[PDB]
Amino acid sequence: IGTGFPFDPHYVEVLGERMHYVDVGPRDGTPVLFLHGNPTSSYVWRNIIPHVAPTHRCIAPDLIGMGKSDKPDLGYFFDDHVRFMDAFIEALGLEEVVLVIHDWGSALGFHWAKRNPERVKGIAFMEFIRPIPTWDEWPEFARETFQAFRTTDVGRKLIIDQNVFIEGTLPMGVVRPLTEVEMDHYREPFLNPVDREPLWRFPNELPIAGEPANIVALVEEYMDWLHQSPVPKLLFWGTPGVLIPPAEAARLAKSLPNCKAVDIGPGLNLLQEDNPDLIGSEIARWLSTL
Ligand SMILES: *CCCCCCNC(=O)CN(C)S(=O)(=O)c1ccc(N(C)C)c2nsnc12
Numbered sequence: 001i002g003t004g005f006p007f008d009p010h011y012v013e014v015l016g017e018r019m020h021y022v023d024v025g026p027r028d029g030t031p032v033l034f035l036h037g038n039p040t041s042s043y044v045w046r047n048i049i050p051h052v053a054p055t056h057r058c059i060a061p062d063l064i065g066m067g068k069s070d071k072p073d074l075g076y077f078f079d080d081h082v083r084f085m086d087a088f089i090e091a092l093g094l095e096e097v098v099l100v101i102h103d104w105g106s107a108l109g110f111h112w113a114k115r116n117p118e119r120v121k122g123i124a125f126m127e128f129i130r131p132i133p134t135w136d137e138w139p140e141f142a143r144e145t146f147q148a149f150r151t152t153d154v155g156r157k158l159i160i161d162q163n164v165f166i167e168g169t170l171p172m173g174v175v176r177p178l179t180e181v182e183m184d185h186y187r188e189p190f191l192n193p194v195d196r197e198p199l200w201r202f203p204n205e206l207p208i209a210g211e212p213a214n215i216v217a218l219v220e221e222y223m224d225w226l227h228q229s230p231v232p233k234l235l236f237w238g239t240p241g242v243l244i245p246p247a248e249a250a251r252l253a254k255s256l257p258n259c260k261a262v263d264i265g266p267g268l269n270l271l272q273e274d275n276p277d278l279i280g281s282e283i284a285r286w287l288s289t290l
């Protein structure tokens with residue numbers, strides 16, 4: 001599995017800020033938009049894009065405050081990302097797109113697809129955001145850790161000062177052992193503690209046990225749309241998973257209209273890091289059928 005990032009930088013002005021994105025492949029077709037989540041960047045798609053780039057345009061932005069994009073002093077709430085990603089998509093002059101989305105990128109991708117259904121010809125998704133009914137279902141320490149993250153005293157000392165979301169939570173979401181070179185690529189954006197604000201805000205935005213209600217409602221809305229939407233779907237899942245366990249994946253595979261499911265094998269959250277070749281190859285095959 002490749003550790004390098006051999007993609008030239010592209011930048012565009014979005015709501016007064018500069019956003020970095022990968023942009024490769026032919027212009028004469030339908031572009032594929034890749035949206036990462038917390039605490040990753042376009043780096044998470046590095047081994048998947050090369051399977052799609054030969055035939056389709058691949059666009060992989062770094063969310064505002066993350067990757068190589070600018071880091072303004074903001075709260076970095078979900079609505080803040082929604083606004084920047086909206087203006088990013090319009091800045092590139094994109095009409096119709098295929099979405100490839102993960103974690104908080106899935107929230108952005110689904111929320112966009114809901115509001116712009118005519119402009120979405122396909123949605124490939126994996127380990128995506130859904131409402132979590134209770135804390136009790138969480139594993140012992142994961143419960144303790146994320147409840148702690150969702151505070152201003154301990155959570156900030158953990159994520160901001162100690163950088164545990166990068167140093168601990170991130171590699172714990174990969175089944176295989178992430179190398180130090182790969183960790184360094186993920187560490188790069190957050191060397192300065194002040195730049196770690198999005199890393200702390202995202203876990204506080206997670207819809208867990210009704211809180212926050214605004215995020216829960218927003219998430220509930222795009223799930224309803226997805227059940228009703230006849231758009232083609234590709235759901236990658238792994239065992240035991242994290243946000244999406246194997247039983248939930250099989251359930252949605254049957255429930256969601258026009259939805260092929262793919263088993264990547266062993267996997268937690270960053271499925272891209274455990275089986276990039278299968279995810280990359282299957283997306284390409286799936287695109288050639290659309
Ligand atoms: C999608 C945003 C978080 C992804 C960060 C990657 N790291 C992990 O997922 C680490 N996990 C293995 S965890 O042990 O911290 C963990 C365990 C369980 C759950 N759930 C019960 C959903 C979880 N949600 S986020 N991290 C989790």
Ligand SMILES: [Cl-]
Nearest residue numbers: 038202203206
């Ligand atoms: Cl998070």
